[PDB]
Protein backbone atom coordinates (compact mmCIF):
# COMPACT_ATOMS: atom_id res chain seq x y z
CA UNK A 1 0.00 0.00 0.00
CA UNK A 2 2.03 2.92 -1.32
CA UNK A 3 -0.23 5.74 -0.12
CA UNK A 4 1.09 8.73 -2.09
CA UNK A 5 1.82 12.33 -1.12
CA UNK A 6 -0.01 15.34 -2.53
CA UNK A 7 1.29 18.37 -4.40
CA UNK A 8 2.09 21.65 -2.69
CA UNK A 9 -0.59 23.57 -4.60
CA UNK A 10 -3.63 21.29 -4.92
CA UNK A 11 -4.29 18.23 -2.79
CA UNK A 12 -5.96 16.65 -5.84
CA UNK A 13 -2.64 16.05 -7.64
CA UNK A 14 -0.64 13.40 -5.84
CA UNK A 15 2.71 11.82 -6.69
CA UNK A 16 3.93 8.30 -5.95
CA UNK A 17 7.24 6.56 -6.61
CA UNK A 18 6.94 3.19 -8.34
CA UNK A 19 7.97 0.08 -6.41
CA UNK A 20 7.72 -3.36 -8.08
CA UNK A 21 6.80 -5.05 -4.78
CA UNK A 22 3.96 -2.84 -3.51
CA UNK A 23 0.51 -1.64 -4.57
CA UNK A 24 -0.83 1.89 -4.98
CA UNK A 25 -3.69 3.55 -3.09
CA UNK A 26 -6.24 5.23 -5.34
CA UNK A 27 -9.33 6.84 -3.80
CA UNK A 28 -11.90 7.53 -6.53
CA UNK A 29 -14.95 9.67 -5.88
CA UNK A 30 -18.11 9.63 -7.97
CA UNK A 31 -18.22 11.70 -11.14
CA UNK A 32 -14.47 12.31 -11.49
CA UNK A 33 -12.16 10.88 -14.14
CA UNK A 34 -8.70 9.93 -12.89
CA UNK A 35 -5.69 10.06 -15.23
CA UNK A 36 -2.98 7.43 -14.76
CA UNK A 37 0.01 8.30 -16.93
CA UNK A 38 2.64 5.79 -18.01
CA UNK A 39 6.34 6.38 -18.55
CA UNK A 40 7.19 7.86 -21.93
CA UNK A 41 7.32 5.34 -24.76
CA UNK A 42 5.86 2.55 -22.62
CA UNK A 43 3.59 0.13 -24.48
CA UNK A 44 0.39 -1.03 -22.80
CA UNK A 45 0.14 -4.82 -23.06
CA UNK A 46 -2.82 -5.96 -20.95
CA UNK A 47 -5.00 -4.58 -18.17
CA UNK A 48 -7.33 -6.36 -15.77
CA UNK A 49 -10.01 -5.05 -13.42
CA UNK A 50 -11.67 -6.76 -10.52
CA UNK A 51 -15.15 -5.65 -11.61
CA UNK A 52 -14.95 -4.58 -15.25
CA UNK A 53 -18.40 -2.99 -14.88
CA UNK A 54 -17.57 -0.97 -11.76
CA UNK A 55 -15.04 1.28 -13.52
CA UNK A 56 -14.89 2.91 -16.95
CA UNK A 57 -11.61 2.55 -18.84
CA UNK A 58 -10.25 4.56 -21.77
CA UNK A 59 -6.68 4.59 -23.05
CA UNK A 60 -4.72 6.67 -25.57
CA UNK A 61 -1.15 5.41 -25.71
CA UNK A 62 0.44 6.02 -22.30
CA UNK A 63 -2.55 8.04 -21.06
CA UNK A 64 -5.09 5.86 -19.23
CA UNK A 65 -8.42 7.45 -18.31
CA UNK A 66 -10.48 5.79 -15.58
CA UNK A 67 -13.88 6.48 -14.04
CA UNK A 68 -16.27 4.86 -11.53
CA UNK A 69 -19.63 3.53 -12.73
CA UNK A 70 -21.16 1.73 -9.74
CA UNK A 71 -21.67 1.92 -6.00
CA UNK A 72 -19.14 0.30 -3.65
CA UNK A 73 -16.61 0.16 -6.49
CA UNK A 74 -13.81 -1.42 -4.45
CA UNK A 75 -11.66 -3.42 -6.87
CA UNK A 76 -8.16 -3.30 -8.34
CA UNK A 77 -6.61 -2.55 -11.72
CA UNK A 78 -3.50 -4.44 -12.85
CA UNK A 79 -2.23 -3.01 -16.15
CA UNK A 80 0.90 -4.71 -17.47
CA UNK A 81 3.40 -3.25 -19.93
CA UNK A 82 6.55 -4.52 -21.61
CA UNK A 83 8.76 -2.87 -18.98
CA UNK A 84 6.78 -3.29 -15.75
CA UNK A 85 3.38 -4.05 -14.23
CA UNK A 86 1.31 -1.47 -12.35
CA UNK A 87 -0.49 -2.44 -9.13
CA UNK A 88 -3.51 -0.51 -7.86
CA UNK A 89 -6.18 -1.08 -5.22
CA UNK A 90 -9.09 1.17 -6.16
CA UNK A 91 -11.23 2.08 -3.14
CA UNK A 92 -14.17 4.39 -3.74
CA UNK A 93 -14.67 7.30 -1.36
CA UNK A 94 -18.23 7.83 -0.13
CA UNK A 95 -18.35 11.58 0.56
CA UNK A 96 -16.95 12.86 -2.77
CA UNK A 97 -13.87 14.54 -1.27
CA UNK A 98 -10.15 14.08 -1.74
CA UNK A 99 -10.37 13.21 -5.43
CA UNK A 100 -7.36 12.51 -7.63
CA UNK A 101 -7.33 14.04 -11.09
CA UNK A 102 -4.14 12.38 -12.31
CA UNK A 103 -1.61 9.99 -10.79
CA UNK A 104 2.08 10.50 -11.51
CA UNK A 105 4.92 8.02 -11.15
CA UNK A 106 8.54 8.78 -10.23
CA UNK A 107 11.08 6.22 -11.43
CA UNK A 108 14.29 6.21 -9.37
CA UNK A 109 16.26 4.15 -11.88
CA UNK A 110 15.32 6.16 -14.98
CA UNK A 111 16.04 9.44 -13.20
CA UNK A 112 19.37 8.11 -11.93
CA UNK A 113 20.25 7.12 -15.49
CA UNK A 114 19.26 10.30 -17.29
CA UNK A 115 20.85 12.53 -14.67
CA UNK A 116 24.14 10.67 -15.11
CA UNK A 117 24.14 11.17 -18.88
CA UNK A 118 23.82 14.96 -18.65
CA UNK A 119 26.63 15.28 -16.11
CA UNK A 120 28.83 12.98 -18.19
CA UNK A 121 28.11 15.07 -21.30
CA UNK A 122 29.03 18.30 -19.52
CA UNK A 123 32.23 16.72 -18.21
CA UNK A 124 33.08 15.43 -21.70
CA UNK A 125 32.68 18.86 -23.27
CA UNK A 126 34.79 20.43 -20.53
CA UNK A 127 37.45 17.77 -21.08
CA UNK A 128 37.61 18.41 -24.82
CA UNK A 129 37.86 22.16 -24.33
CA UNK A 130 40.48 21.92 -21.58
CA UNK A 131 43.08 20.73 -24.12
CA UNK A 132 46.06 20.45 -21.76
CA UNK A 133 49.26 18.42 -21.93
CA UNK A 134 49.92 19.14 -25.61
CA UNK A 135 53.26 19.48 -27.38
CA UNK A 136 53.42 21.55 -30.56
CA UNK A 137 55.70 21.06 -33.57
CA UNK A 138 56.59 24.23 -35.47
CA UNK A 139 59.56 23.06 -37.57
CA UNK A 140 57.72 23.25 -40.89
CA UNK A 141 59.27 24.49 -44.14
CA UNK A 142 57.81 25.07 -47.58
CA UNK A 143 58.95 25.38 -51.18
CA UNK A 144 56.94 26.10 -54.30
CA UNK A 145 54.13 28.50 -55.21
CA UNK A 146 54.03 30.76 -52.17
CA UNK A 147 50.75 32.38 -53.19
CA UNK A 148 48.75 29.43 -51.83
CA UNK A 149 50.92 29.16 -48.73
CA UNK A 150 49.58 28.96 -45.18
CA UNK A 151 50.50 31.73 -42.81
CA UNK A 152 51.26 29.07 -40.17
CA UNK A 153 51.60 25.31 -39.98
CA UNK A 154 52.09 23.20 -36.86
CA UNK A 155 51.10 19.86 -35.39
CA UNK A 156 50.18 18.75 -31.88
CA UNK A 157 51.42 15.19 -32.27
CA UNK A 158 48.10 13.85 -33.54
CA UNK A 159 46.78 16.27 -36.19
CA UNK A 160 48.54 18.71 -38.51
CA UNK A 161 47.14 22.23 -38.81
CA UNK A 162 47.56 24.69 -41.68
CA UNK A 163 46.39 28.24 -40.96
CA UNK A 164 45.38 30.42 -43.89
CA UNK A 165 44.82 34.15 -44.06
CA UNK A 166 41.40 35.74 -44.43
CA UNK A 167 41.92 36.73 -48.07
CA UNK A 168 43.29 33.37 -49.24
CA UNK A 169 41.34 30.56 -50.86
CA UNK A 170 41.55 27.26 -49.02
CA UNK A 171 43.45 24.72 -51.15
CA UNK A 172 43.55 20.92 -51.20
CA UNK A 173 46.16 19.23 -49.01
CA UNK A 174 47.49 15.79 -49.89
CA UNK A 175 49.52 13.06 -48.25
CA UNK A 176 52.93 12.49 -49.84
CA UNK A 177 54.52 9.15 -49.00
CA UNK A 178 58.14 8.04 -49.33
CA UNK A 179 58.14 7.60 -53.11
CA UNK A 180 56.40 10.92 -53.73
CA UNK A 181 52.93 9.54 -54.37
CA UNK A 182 50.12 11.83 -53.30
CA UNK A 183 47.02 10.42 -51.67
CA UNK A 184 43.91 11.71 -49.96
CA UNK A 185 43.87 12.49 -46.25
CA UNK A 186 40.73 13.43 -44.29
CA UNK A 187 40.53 17.03 -43.17
CA UNK A 188 38.36 19.04 -40.83
CA UNK A 189 38.11 22.83 -40.95
CA UNK A 190 38.58 24.33 -37.50
CA UNK A 191 39.03 27.86 -36.21
CA UNK A 192 36.69 30.73 -35.48
CA UNK A 193 36.67 32.02 -39.06
CA UNK A 194 37.25 28.57 -40.59
CA UNK A 195 40.83 29.56 -41.40
CA UNK A 196 42.54 26.36 -40.18
CA UNK A 197 42.53 23.02 -41.98
CA UNK A 198 43.27 20.14 -39.63
CA UNK A 199 44.38 16.95 -41.35
CA UNK A 200 44.06 13.78 -39.32
CA UNK A 201 47.65 12.55 -39.66
CA UNK A 202 51.24 13.54 -38.95
CA UNK A 203 53.51 13.01 -41.95
CA UNK A 204 56.92 14.34 -43.02
CA UNK A 205 55.86 15.80 -46.38
CA UNK A 206 52.61 17.41 -47.53
CA UNK A 207 51.44 18.72 -50.90
CA UNK A 208 49.15 21.74 -51.29
CA UNK A 209 47.35 22.22 -54.60
CA UNK A 210 44.94 24.89 -55.80
CA UNK A 211 44.11 25.04 -59.47
CA UNK A 212 47.47 24.76 -61.20
CA UNK A 213 49.72 25.88 -58.34
CA UNK A 214 51.53 23.50 -56.01
CA UNK A 215 53.33 24.01 -52.72
CA UNK A 216 55.33 21.44 -50.77
CA UNK A 217 55.35 21.51 -46.96
CA UNK A 218 58.11 19.63 -45.13
CA UNK A 219 58.03 18.46 -41.52
CA UNK A 220 61.63 19.05 -40.48
CA UNK A 221 61.24 17.49 -37.01
CA UNK A 222 59.34 14.33 -37.85
CA UNK A 223 58.63 12.09 -34.87
CA UNK A 224 58.03 8.52 -36.06
CA UNK A 225 56.95 7.34 -32.62
CA UNK A 226 54.19 9.81 -31.99
CA UNK A 227 51.98 9.52 -28.93
CA UNK A 228 49.62 6.52 -28.69
CA UNK A 229 45.84 6.88 -28.87
CA UNK A 230 44.80 4.82 -25.86
CA UNK A 231 41.48 6.62 -25.31
CA UNK A 232 39.82 6.39 -28.71
CA UNK A 233 39.16 10.13 -28.95
CA UNK A 234 41.15 13.10 -30.16
CA UNK A 235 42.01 14.03 -26.57
CA UNK A 236 43.59 12.09 -23.69
CA UNK A 237 40.92 13.31 -21.25
CA UNK A 238 37.90 11.64 -22.91
CA UNK A 239 37.48 7.88 -23.17
CA UNK A 240 35.35 6.23 -25.83
CA UNK A 241 33.55 3.36 -24.13
CA UNK A 242 31.54 0.55 -25.70
CA UNK A 243 27.83 1.19 -25.30
CA UNK A 244 26.28 -1.35 -27.65
CA UNK A 245 27.41 -4.18 -25.41
CA UNK A 246 26.14 -7.22 -27.32
CA UNK B 1 1.07 -27.29 -0.56
CA UNK B 2 3.61 -24.57 -1.18
CA UNK B 3 2.05 -21.47 0.39
CA UNK B 4 3.09 -18.25 -1.39
CA UNK B 5 5.48 -16.35 0.86
CA UNK B 6 4.49 -12.73 1.38
CA UNK B 7 6.83 -9.84 0.63
CA UNK B 8 8.14 -7.25 3.05
CA UNK B 9 6.38 -4.18 1.61
CA UNK B 10 2.89 -5.62 1.14
CA UNK B 11 0.90 -8.78 1.81
CA UNK B 12 -0.72 -8.59 -1.64
CA UNK B 13 2.54 -9.61 -3.37
CA UNK B 14 3.65 -13.16 -2.58
CA UNK B 15 6.54 -15.14 -4.04
CA UNK B 16 6.75 -18.91 -4.51
CA UNK B 17 9.75 -21.04 -5.44
CA UNK B 18 8.73 -23.64 -8.01
CA UNK B 19 8.64 -27.30 -6.96
CA UNK B 20 7.51 -29.94 -9.49
CA UNK B 21 6.39 -32.30 -6.69
CA UNK B 22 4.29 -29.65 -4.93
CA UNK B 23 1.28 -27.45 -5.61
CA UNK B 24 0.46 -23.77 -5.16
CA UNK B 25 -2.11 -22.76 -2.54
CA UNK B 26 -3.66 -19.61 -4.03
CA UNK B 27 -5.93 -17.79 -1.58
CA UNK B 28 -8.09 -15.70 -3.90
CA UNK B 29 -10.57 -13.18 -2.54
CA UNK B 30 -13.75 -12.08 -4.23
CA UNK B 31 -13.68 -9.42 -6.95
CA UNK B 32 -9.94 -9.16 -7.65
CA UNK B 33 -7.67 -10.28 -10.48
CA UNK B 34 -4.70 -12.48 -9.57
CA UNK B 35 -1.75 -11.89 -11.90
CA UNK B 36 0.37 -15.03 -12.26
CA UNK B 37 3.65 -14.47 -14.09
CA UNK B 38 5.34 -17.22 -16.06
CA UNK B 39 9.02 -17.37 -16.91
CA UNK B 40 10.14 -15.35 -19.92
CA UNK B 41 10.19 -17.32 -23.14
CA UNK B 42 7.78 -19.92 -21.75
CA UNK B 43 5.20 -20.94 -24.35
CA UNK B 44 1.78 -21.69 -22.86
CA UNK B 45 0.50 -25.06 -24.05
CA UNK B 46 -2.83 -25.82 -22.35
CA UNK B 47 -4.76 -25.29 -19.12
CA UNK B 48 -7.62 -27.08 -17.39
CA UNK B 49 -9.93 -25.72 -14.69
CA UNK B 50 -11.95 -27.68 -12.19
CA UNK B 51 -14.85 -25.47 -13.26
CA UNK B 52 -14.62 -23.53 -16.50
CA UNK B 53 -17.33 -21.29 -15.02
CA UNK B 54 -16.15 -20.78 -11.43
CA UNK B 55 -13.14 -18.68 -12.49
CA UNK B 56 -12.73 -16.32 -15.44
CA UNK B 57 -9.46 -16.90 -17.29
CA UNK B 58 -7.77 -14.56 -19.77
CA UNK B 59 -4.18 -15.07 -20.89
CA UNK B 60 -1.82 -12.88 -22.94
CA UNK B 61 1.54 -14.43 -23.74
CA UNK B 62 3.10 -15.31 -20.40
CA UNK B 63 0.60 -13.16 -18.45
CA UNK B 64 -2.17 -14.98 -16.58
CA UNK B 65 -5.27 -13.33 -15.15
CA UNK B 66 -7.97 -15.25 -13.30
CA UNK B 67 -11.09 -13.97 -11.60
CA UNK B 68 -13.72 -15.85 -9.56
CA UNK B 69 -17.22 -15.78 -11.06
CA UNK B 70 -19.18 -17.89 -8.57
CA UNK B 71 -19.64 -18.68 -4.91
CA UNK B 72 -17.74 -21.51 -3.23
CA UNK B 73 -15.41 -21.64 -6.23
CA UNK B 74 -13.01 -24.27 -4.91
CA UNK B 75 -11.51 -25.91 -7.99
CA UNK B 76 -8.07 -26.57 -9.42
CA UNK B 77 -5.94 -25.04 -12.16
CA UNK B 78 -3.46 -27.21 -14.04
CA UNK B 79 -1.85 -25.05 -16.72
CA UNK B 80 0.74 -27.00 -18.71
CA UNK B 81 3.40 -25.40 -20.89
CA UNK B 82 6.33 -26.61 -22.97
CA UNK B 83 8.72 -26.34 -20.02
CA UNK B 84 6.56 -27.54 -17.11
CA UNK B 85 3.05 -27.83 -15.67
CA UNK B 86 1.82 -25.60 -12.85
CA UNK B 87 -0.52 -26.77 -10.08
CA UNK B 88 -2.94 -24.52 -8.17
CA UNK B 89 -5.48 -25.24 -5.41
CA UNK B 90 -7.84 -22.28 -5.72
CA UNK B 91 -9.38 -21.92 -2.25
CA UNK B 92 -11.90 -19.08 -2.02
CA UNK B 93 -11.57 -16.64 0.88
CA UNK B 94 -14.90 -15.72 2.45
CA UNK B 95 -14.10 -12.54 4.41
CA UNK B 96 -12.26 -10.71 1.58
CA UNK B 97 -9.04 -10.11 3.53
CA UNK B 98 -5.43 -10.98 2.80
CA UNK B 99 -5.76 -10.83 -0.98
CA UNK B 100 -3.23 -12.20 -3.49
CA UNK B 101 -2.65 -9.58 -6.16
CA UNK B 102 0.10 -11.37 -8.12
CA UNK B 103 1.89 -14.70 -7.88
CA UNK B 104 5.57 -14.57 -8.81
CA UNK B 105 7.65 -17.69 -9.41
CA UNK B 106 11.30 -18.35 -8.62
CA UNK B 107 13.08 -21.17 -10.44
CA UNK B 108 16.04 -22.64 -8.50
CA UNK B 109 17.49 -24.74 -11.32
CA UNK B 110 17.35 -21.87 -13.81
CA UNK B 111 19.08 -19.52 -11.37
CA UNK B 112 21.75 -22.16 -10.72
CA UNK B 113 22.25 -22.64 -14.47
CA UNK B 114 22.58 -18.90 -15.00
CA UNK B 115 24.97 -18.40 -12.08
CA UNK B 116 27.15 -21.36 -13.05
CA UNK B 117 27.55 -19.97 -16.55
CA UNK B 118 28.43 -16.49 -15.29
CA UNK B 119 31.03 -17.90 -12.90
CA UNK B 120 32.46 -19.99 -15.74
CA UNK B 121 32.72 -16.91 -17.95
CA UNK B 122 34.46 -14.99 -15.17
CA UNK B 123 36.96 -17.82 -14.74
CA UNK B 124 37.49 -17.98 -18.51
CA UNK B 125 38.33 -14.28 -18.75
CA UNK B 126 40.62 -14.51 -15.73
CA UNK B 127 42.46 -17.46 -17.28
CA UNK B 128 42.75 -15.78 -20.68
CA UNK B 129 44.21 -12.63 -19.16
CA UNK B 130 46.52 -14.26 -16.61
CA UNK B 131 48.78 -15.54 -19.43
CA UNK B 132 51.31 -17.30 -17.20
CA UNK B 133 54.43 -19.20 -18.19
CA UNK B 134 54.81 -18.16 -21.83
CA UNK B 135 58.11 -18.04 -23.70
CA UNK B 136 58.96 -15.13 -25.99
CA UNK B 137 61.19 -15.10 -29.08
CA UNK B 138 62.86 -11.79 -29.95
CA UNK B 139 65.43 -12.89 -32.56
CA UNK B 140 63.87 -11.05 -35.50
CA UNK B 141 65.73 -9.25 -38.29
CA UNK B 142 64.51 -7.03 -41.11
CA UNK B 143 65.74 -5.81 -44.48
CA UNK B 144 64.01 -3.66 -47.05
CA UNK B 145 62.00 -0.44 -46.89
CA UNK B 146 62.66 0.50 -43.27
CA UNK B 147 60.11 3.32 -43.25
CA UNK B 148 57.29 0.79 -42.85
CA UNK B 149 59.16 -1.23 -40.25
CA UNK B 150 57.64 -2.20 -36.90
CA UNK B 151 59.20 -0.80 -33.78
CA UNK B 152 59.16 -4.29 -32.22
CA UNK B 153 58.45 -7.86 -33.29
CA UNK B 154 58.29 -11.06 -31.27
CA UNK B 155 56.30 -14.26 -30.85
CA UNK B 156 55.13 -16.43 -27.97
CA UNK B 157 55.27 -19.76 -29.80
CA UNK B 158 51.74 -19.56 -31.19
CA UNK B 159 51.26 -16.08 -32.70
CA UNK B 160 53.66 -13.49 -34.11
CA UNK B 161 53.26 -9.86 -33.02
CA UNK B 162 54.44 -6.79 -34.91
CA UNK B 163 54.29 -3.53 -32.97
CA UNK B 164 53.98 -0.31 -34.94
CA UNK B 165 54.53 3.25 -33.80
CA UNK B 166 51.63 5.65 -33.38
CA UNK B 167 52.33 7.62 -36.57
CA UNK B 168 52.97 4.65 -38.87
CA UNK B 169 50.29 3.34 -41.20
CA UNK B 170 49.53 -0.29 -40.40
CA UNK B 171 50.82 -2.28 -43.38
CA UNK B 172 49.83 -5.66 -44.78
CA UNK B 173 51.74 -8.75 -43.64
CA UNK B 174 52.17 -11.82 -45.84
CA UNK B 175 53.29 -15.36 -45.07
CA UNK B 176 56.37 -16.46 -47.03
CA UNK B 177 57.10 -20.13 -47.65
CA UNK B 178 60.35 -21.90 -48.55
CA UNK B 179 60.28 -21.13 -52.28
CA UNK B 180 59.56 -17.45 -51.61
CA UNK B 181 55.89 -17.45 -52.56
CA UNK B 182 53.61 -15.31 -50.44
CA UNK B 183 50.18 -16.18 -49.13
CA UNK B 184 47.62 -14.52 -46.91
CA UNK B 185 47.74 -15.23 -43.19
CA UNK B 186 44.92 -14.25 -40.81
CA UNK B 187 45.64 -11.38 -38.47
CA UNK B 188 44.02 -9.76 -35.47
CA UNK B 189 44.84 -6.18 -34.51
CA UNK B 190 45.43 -5.97 -30.77
CA UNK B 191 46.94 -3.52 -28.32
CA UNK B 192 45.57 -0.61 -26.34
CA UNK B 193 45.98 1.82 -29.25
CA UNK B 194 45.62 -0.90 -31.92
CA UNK B 195 49.36 -0.71 -32.57
CA UNK B 196 50.03 -4.47 -32.67
CA UNK B 197 49.22 -6.82 -35.53
CA UNK B 198 49.05 -10.43 -34.34
CA UNK B 199 49.31 -13.01 -37.11
CA UNK B 200 48.15 -16.51 -36.30
CA UNK B 201 51.30 -18.43 -37.24
CA UNK B 202 54.98 -18.76 -36.39
CA UNK B 203 57.09 -18.79 -39.56
CA UNK B 204 60.75 -18.14 -40.39
CA UNK B 205 60.16 -15.43 -42.99
CA UNK B 206 57.51 -12.72 -43.35
CA UNK B 207 56.60 -10.06 -45.89
CA UNK B 208 55.35 -6.56 -45.07
CA UNK B 209 53.91 -4.42 -47.86
CA UNK B 210 52.39 -0.95 -47.98
CA UNK B 211 51.78 0.48 -51.41
CA UNK B 212 54.98 0.10 -53.42
CA UNK B 213 57.25 -0.50 -50.43
CA UNK B 214 58.27 -3.89 -49.08
CA UNK B 215 60.06 -5.10 -45.97
CA UNK B 216 61.25 -8.61 -45.16
CA UNK B 217 61.15 -9.94 -41.59
CA UNK B 218 63.36 -12.90 -40.68
CA UNK B 219 62.84 -15.18 -37.69
CA UNK B 220 66.33 -16.09 -36.55
CA UNK B 221 65.23 -18.63 -33.93
CA UNK B 222 62.55 -20.61 -35.73
CA UNK B 223 61.37 -23.56 -33.66
CA UNK B 224 60.03 -26.23 -36.03
CA UNK B 225 58.17 -27.90 -33.17
CA UNK B 226 56.57 -25.21 -31.10
CA UNK B 227 54.06 -26.03 -28.38
CA UNK B 228 51.02 -28.19 -29.23
CA UNK B 229 47.49 -26.82 -28.93
CA UNK B 230 45.89 -29.42 -26.68
CA UNK B 231 43.11 -27.16 -25.38
CA UNK B 232 41.50 -25.69 -28.48
CA UNK B 233 42.00 -22.09 -27.38
CA UNK B 234 44.88 -19.66 -27.57
CA UNK B 235 45.59 -20.24 -23.89
CA UNK B 236 46.89 -23.35 -22.09
CA UNK B 237 44.43 -22.69 -19.25
CA UNK B 238 41.11 -22.53 -21.14
CA UNK B 239 39.69 -25.72 -22.63
CA UNK B 240 37.29 -25.73 -25.56
CA UNK B 241 34.63 -28.34 -24.89
CA UNK B 242 31.98 -29.80 -27.19
CA UNK B 243 28.57 -28.47 -26.22
CA UNK B 244 26.40 -29.52 -29.15
CA UNK B 245 26.67 -33.21 -28.32
CA UNK B 246 24.49 -34.80 -31.01
Amino acid sequence: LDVPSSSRYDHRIRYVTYNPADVVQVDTVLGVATHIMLEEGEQYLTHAFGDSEAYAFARKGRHIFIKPQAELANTNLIVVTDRRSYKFRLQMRNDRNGAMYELAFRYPDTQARQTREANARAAVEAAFEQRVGAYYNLKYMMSGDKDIAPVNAWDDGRFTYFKFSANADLPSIYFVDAEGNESLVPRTTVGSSNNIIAVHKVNPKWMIRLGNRALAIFNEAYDPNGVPNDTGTASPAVRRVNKGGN
Amino acid sequence: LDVPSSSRYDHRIRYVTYNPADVVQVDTVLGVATHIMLEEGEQYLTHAFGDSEAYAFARKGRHIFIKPQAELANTNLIVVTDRRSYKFRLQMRNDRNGAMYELAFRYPDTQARQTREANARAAVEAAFEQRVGAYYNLKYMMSGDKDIAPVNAWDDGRFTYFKFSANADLPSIYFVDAEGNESLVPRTTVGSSNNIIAVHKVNPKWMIRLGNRALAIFNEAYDPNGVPNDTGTASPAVRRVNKGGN
Binding site: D51, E53, A54 | -
Partner: peptide
Protein backbone atom coordinates in the same frame (compact mmCIF):
# COMPACT_ATOMS: atom_id res chain seq x y z
CA UNK C 1 -31.57 -6.57 -2.65
CA UNK C 2 -29.39 -4.34 -0.49
CA UNK C 3 -26.56 -2.36 -2.14
CA UNK C 4 -24.12 -4.88 -0.66
CA UNK C 5 -26.02 -7.69 -2.39
CA UNK C 6 -26.10 -5.89 -5.74
CA UNK C 7 -22.40 -5.08 -5.38
CA UNK C 8 -21.62 -8.76 -4.76
CA UNK C 9 -23.69 -9.90 -7.74
CA UNK C 10 -22.09 -7.34 -10.06
CA UNK C 11 -18.72 -8.42 -8.68
CA UNK C 12 -19.38 -12.07 -9.51
CA UNK C 13 -20.88 -11.51 -12.95
CA UNK C 14 -18.29 -9.07 -14.29
CA UNK C 15 -15.59 -10.32 -16.63
Amino acid sequence: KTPYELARERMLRSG
